[PDB]
Point group: C2
Chain length 79, copies 2
């Protein structure tokens, strides 16, 4: 499973989810095509677990880092 819904409606998402598929899931709106690629791109480095950024009205937080691999993300809608 690449994506699951938590009890509060927020999403746990695999770093490999393609950005195209992500956009379609979130109903939202390079040098990347997956969610993990996008995070590396934003930070310009491999982020710590618990770091986050805001993208297309959503907060993306790193929740699991396996070696250098951004394995799992938490997505929550702002507001």
């Amino acid at each position: 499973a690449l994506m699951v819904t938590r009890e509060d409606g927020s999403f746990l998402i695999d770093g490999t989810l393609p950005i195209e598929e992500l956009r379609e899931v979130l109903g939202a709106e390079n040098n990347y095509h997956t969610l993990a690629g996008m995070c590396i791109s934003y930070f310009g480095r491999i982020p710590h677990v618990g770091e986050y950024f805001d993208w297309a009205g959503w907060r993306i937080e790193i929740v699991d880092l396996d070696g250098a691999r951004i394995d799992k993300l938490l997505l929550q809608r702002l507001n």
Copy 2:
């Protein structure tokens, strides 16, 4: 890193964290000695991501499952 603190004070924790070390971290109070072992023990099966249970005044939620391995947990204090 086996454990990190999120912005809201909740913990992201590796399934391998020993229960003894977990108790000491949470300030809390078999057929298991790690956090992942405890989850498998509770559910009596490999749980889905997003499943959770309450233990010693804390909520434990599965956030990343890698094959059969319970890789990452979210811990939040109740109340």
